[PDB]
Amino acid sequence: ELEALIAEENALRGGYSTPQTLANRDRCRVAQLALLDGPFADLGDGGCYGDLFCKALKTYNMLCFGIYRLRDAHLSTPSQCTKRYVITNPPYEFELVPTDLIFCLMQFDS
């Protein structure tokens, strides 16, 4: 419908807020979470990825689908590199480190 409207006018037209549009507002968005100080802080210290996935889905209806992991995290020596790489859909028994980011789908709330 928005495609047709843009095709008709070649512009984006404003409109007054109605309950139907406000209900249409509620969707899911792409986000990243840190395990340093969130509710999953204790679980991110050596816990498994599956427990995090289950807790996020059951509690906040959050869908975790990837780990953005610090590149120099498997090395014992400390490093100053802040680069991170992408791990898509890790298994249930995948281990977690506190310096990880979790891809997630947030639900809209007011």
Binding site: A7, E8, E9, N10
Partner: protein, 119 residues
Amino acid sequence: AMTVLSGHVVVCIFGDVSSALIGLRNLVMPLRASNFHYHELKHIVFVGSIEYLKREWETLHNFPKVSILPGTPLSRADLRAVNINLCDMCVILSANQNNIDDTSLQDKECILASLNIKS
């Protein structure tokens, strides 16, 4: 949009400031023949680039009912403003008579314009 046009002629032109002239007077002269009464004359509205139409207006300013809507023939808003559903005829012309890498592709504009109006 404020004025209401019914039983008129809409000439859509794919003009350009550097394209070759097509001599629009040869289209307006037969429609302004003296054997038609004044009330029988059909309003003519040119929809196209004003840069191209300024080069042609020198030979068109002596005719009674001619209007210009600066814009493009490929926009539904301009066609709705000119009441395309009540016109007697829509004439789609392509001024860009320049050579193209493929001969058939020279008709890429007009065909799409037609397929717009039918939809």
